[PDB]
Amino acid sequence: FCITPTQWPAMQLNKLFWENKLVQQLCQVGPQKSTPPLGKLWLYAMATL
Amino acid sequence: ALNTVSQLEIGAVDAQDVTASAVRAFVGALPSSGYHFGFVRQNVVFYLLSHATVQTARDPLYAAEQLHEQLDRFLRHQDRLPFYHNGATLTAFQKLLQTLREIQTVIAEQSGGQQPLVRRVITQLETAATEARPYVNCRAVAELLDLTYQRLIYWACTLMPYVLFRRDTDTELDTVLLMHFFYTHYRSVNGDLAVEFQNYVKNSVRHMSSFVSSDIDGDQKPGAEHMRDVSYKLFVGNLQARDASGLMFPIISTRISTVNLYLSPERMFFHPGLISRLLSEEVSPRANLDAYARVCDRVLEDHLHTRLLDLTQMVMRLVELGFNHDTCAAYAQMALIQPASQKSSLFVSEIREKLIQIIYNFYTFFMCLYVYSPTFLFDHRRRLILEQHRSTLIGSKEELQHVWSNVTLNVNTHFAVQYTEEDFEAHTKGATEAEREYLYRDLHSKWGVHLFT
Amino acid sequence: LQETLATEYFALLHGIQTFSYGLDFRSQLEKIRDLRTRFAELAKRRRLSNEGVLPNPRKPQATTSLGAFTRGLNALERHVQLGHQYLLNKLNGSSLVYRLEDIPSVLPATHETDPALIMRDRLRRLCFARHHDTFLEVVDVFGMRQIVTQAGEPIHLVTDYGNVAFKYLALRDDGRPLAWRRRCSGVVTTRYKAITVAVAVCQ
Amino acid sequence: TTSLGAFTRGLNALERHVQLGHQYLLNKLNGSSLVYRLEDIPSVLPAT
Amino acid sequence: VFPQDMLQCLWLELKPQYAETYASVSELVQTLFQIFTQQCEMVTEGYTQPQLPTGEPVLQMIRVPRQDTEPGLLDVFIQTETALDYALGSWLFGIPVCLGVHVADLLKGQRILVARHLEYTSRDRDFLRIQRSRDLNLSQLLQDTWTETPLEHCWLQAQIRRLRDYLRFPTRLEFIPLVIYNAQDH
């Protein structure tokens, strides 16, 4: 099929998947402040287990 | 002993806790000779019930029946006054318990023409209360009657029919608004209202577009903020729908020119937008507001020109006009919110003062009705109620001191708790000079006034 | 006599808690002063004390001394007086409103008390501008969990957001940021693209 | 032969343990809006 | 107040350089709230005295340490003036404004090139449309944010009334503002 870029707006689906507040707070625990949020890995761990 | 029994008068006791052996010990340990000990030798059961409470148990019938059985045992264990005797006290209390059972039976039966059934059953309940009326002094019967009246009035205010709303002069907007108010104040059993709404919206498709704005300008208009919900679940075709999505629909035109040609002035209270714009004093000077001016004047004149059946009659007369307690309170809030100084015509100012009178009077009437009972406790709480009302509704405004008379006059007219000096004389026809003083003291402690000497 | 006046005291406590008296600070002051005089008269008929645990409105107790009642009276006086002082200071500091009388009194007709909200608004109000540095937690005369500094000024009265929209957008932080934007389910002007191209070429 | 100062130190240790646990729970409820009240929080049994 | 589509269009059309790391003005707002909350630190501690001198039973005492550099994000947003700031201010307060990009300096600064970027006045239809599209409803915030605070509730109602009254009737300055801003970083 085909999609018109102008008509279709762009969301930030991360805000529902891993950029939401609760998962970020759950994954904030890390050795140092330089570590990025671990919700990306947290969803991986949940899906695997 | 006198101080203890006076504190007992001031306080209250539990029906379950008191037993026949407890009453026997209380009588026996009490000194034999005294100007109150004779009465407790004569009318211990009535005197004990004068201060007892059952409201804590939340089940009046069973706890009061247990108290009645314990008192029956004490009366088996046990000529001054035929009108008031311990055996007569037990008989009257058993009659009252029969009334308290049949009120619940009526509520269950009626809640599952319905109007004649409601009228006849409430008349039976009124007759039952009249049978139980004379011994209003007792705190136990006081709370029993209080809870009974609370339940019956709360059920009756909701079980209103919809026959009186329809008029030949009612327009499409007026009819949908009437049934909308019916939905938002009565949905317990009347489930066919949504079906009738869905049937009717297809009839008035052409007429529904006459009283709406464009999209872009309707939202900024005053008063659409409060009527957005009624408009949304008018347009969607289902009164059960919720406007959680924040959609923008064809906003209703609240202008007087559109309203007069598309509405009727008598049924305005169902429409919130006109109330909001009238209180806000944002009305254009050219606007012709004689319609609601005359309607407000005639309604206030009829209400001010004015039994439990009569109370109920006025109840469904007032709410038939769409006056709901929550709606009246919420649309009396902005009367205080709106500024006192603004530019408006003298007729607009006069009708605003009239509507302030109306909102205050009906709000006070409705909240007193929610706590209404022909008992001393009603006036006892009404004293604090009027103090709080003076604190909040009247405020420090000087112009609001004129509008005070109608509120108190109407509330004391419709919710008067009657007590007769002849009633007390009959209650104390056989009571000697020794015993009358403490019945008087208990009555003064309960009611809070020096009614007679 | 004492029990009836105690019930009146608890009713006044509930009315202040439910905001049944509105902005009429003078009425509340007169009522609490009359109640204090009545309790003093009760003590004289029956010595006042400034020590003792506060009476419990949820569980009335006949073992409460008159000193506890006097302490509760002075606590109510302090509450209403500090509130009126905060209104006076905010009226002086803000020129948007004209007079206190023009400010209305809201009714408890719109009542909704979630413990989660009741705790979250207070915890977010903690680090706002308050007169004293440190902080503590107590149980108020009304019987609920009120939080105050060592001065005793209520946090909801000593700390404010300064804007309705600030508070609304601060307590809306639940899960995903925007909900109505998702609910609505919904690219540059060509002139801006042209001016960008022209400015880049010129530079 | 344990001294009274040892018992005072033990009292301080228990007090700090309970206060530290309570403040950590308070911080966890503060940082996480998932739980609204300590009452809803379950208590496990030491049977296992 | 403004619709989210128009806000997205303005955000994409004039992306601030320091704000280009994000995708919306709103995201900036929640991140600023997050950093403000992160500045606040709460610590709970015990107290020897169980009650105050007044006598209220004290359970625990809480202290707020604010101990600790690169400039802060909220700061750099504060002292940096952007076309976003003036555009949003003009649209919110119902006043026009003229935004233009400074190309360069010519004739030893005697003449300055100001390219026609956009103009706001009562004439062009877009300004009128965006001014009338403002939804001055804020009582829904009061309904959605009831926290047993009736005193603050009345204060917020009065403040909303005053601000809406001011916004409906802006002060006019003969429609002659002008702003000069850079294009590389807005």
PDB file of C-alpha atoms in Angstrom, chain B residues 10 244-247 329 333 336-337 340 363 380 384 387-388 390-392 395-398, chain C residues 1 3-4 11 15 20-22 24 26-27 31 101-102 104-107 109 180 183-184:
ATOM      1  CA  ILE B  10     -28.592  14.794  78.288  1.00  0.00           C
ATOM      2  CA  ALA B 244     -14.380  12.190  28.196  1.00  0.00           C
ATOM      3  CA  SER B 245     -12.826  12.683  24.704  1.00  0.00           C
ATOM      4  CA  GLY B 246     -13.123  16.523  24.865  1.00  0.00           C
ATOM      5  CA  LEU B 247     -14.746  16.706  21.384  1.00  0.00           C
ATOM      6  CA  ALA B 329     -26.526  24.625  44.726  1.00  0.00           C
ATOM      7  CA  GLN B 333     -22.502  29.225  43.538  1.00  0.00           C
ATOM      8  CA  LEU B 336     -21.572  34.628  45.059  1.00  0.00           C
ATOM      9  CA  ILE B 337     -18.868  34.168  42.409  1.00  0.00           C
ATOM     10  CA  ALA B 340     -21.571  42.864  42.552  1.00  0.00           C
ATOM     11  CA  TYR B 363     -31.362  25.403  48.297  1.00  0.00           C
ATOM     12  CA  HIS B 380     -31.842  21.714  66.953  1.00  0.00           C
ATOM     13  CA  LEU B 384     -26.607  25.488  63.417  1.00  0.00           C
ATOM     14  CA  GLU B 387     -25.827  29.985  61.567  1.00  0.00           C
ATOM     15  CA  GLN B 388     -23.745  28.324  58.844  1.00  0.00           C
ATOM     16  CA  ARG B 390     -25.561  33.255  57.568  1.00  0.00           C
ATOM     17  CA  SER B 391     -21.819  32.602  57.543  1.00  0.00           C
ATOM     18  CA  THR B 392     -21.588  31.435  53.914  1.00  0.00           C
ATOM     19  CA  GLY B 395     -21.728  36.726  53.800  1.00  0.00           C
ATOM     20  CA  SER B 396     -20.867  40.346  54.548  1.00  0.00           C
ATOM     21  CA  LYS B 397     -23.059  41.731  51.747  1.00  0.00           C
ATOM     22  CA  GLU B 398     -25.409  44.477  52.924  1.00  0.00           C
TER      23      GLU B 398
ATOM     24  CA  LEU C   1     -24.550  20.316  79.559  1.00  0.00           C
ATOM     25  CA  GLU C   3     -21.754  16.744  76.499  1.00  0.00           C
ATOM     26  CA  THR C   4     -24.057  19.021  74.485  1.00  0.00           C
ATOM     27  CA  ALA C  11     -20.095  20.101  64.890  1.00  0.00           C
ATOM     28  CA  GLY C  15     -18.247  22.636  59.636  1.00  0.00           C
ATOM     29  CA  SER C  20     -19.614  25.346  55.838  1.00  0.00           C
ATOM     30  CA  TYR C  21     -18.721  28.854  57.077  1.00  0.00           C
ATOM     31  CA  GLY C  22     -17.026  30.180  53.932  1.00  0.00           C
ATOM     32  CA  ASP C  24     -16.757  34.738  57.118  1.00  0.00           C
ATOM     33  CA  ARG C  26     -15.487  37.067  61.873  1.00  0.00           C
ATOM     34  CA  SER C  27     -18.341  34.578  62.320  1.00  0.00           C
ATOM     35  CA  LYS C  31     -18.359  31.288  67.469  1.00  0.00           C
ATOM     36  CA  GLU C 101     -15.928  40.308  49.671  1.00  0.00           C
ATOM     37  CA  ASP C 102     -15.881  39.921  45.882  1.00  0.00           C
ATOM     38  CA  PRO C 104     -16.831  33.963  46.764  1.00  0.00           C
ATOM     39  CA  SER C 105     -17.176  31.056  49.179  1.00  0.00           C
ATOM     40  CA  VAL C 106     -17.378  27.619  47.577  1.00  0.00           C
ATOM     41  CA  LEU C 107     -19.832  24.950  48.789  1.00  0.00           C
ATOM     42  CA  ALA C 109     -21.461  20.302  46.838  1.00  0.00           C
ATOM     43  CA  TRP C 180      -6.993  14.174  26.041  1.00  0.00           C
ATOM     44  CA  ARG C 183      -8.207  10.822  23.135  1.00  0.00           C
ATOM     45  CA  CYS C 184      -8.522  13.298  20.252  1.00  0.00           C
TER      46      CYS C 184
END
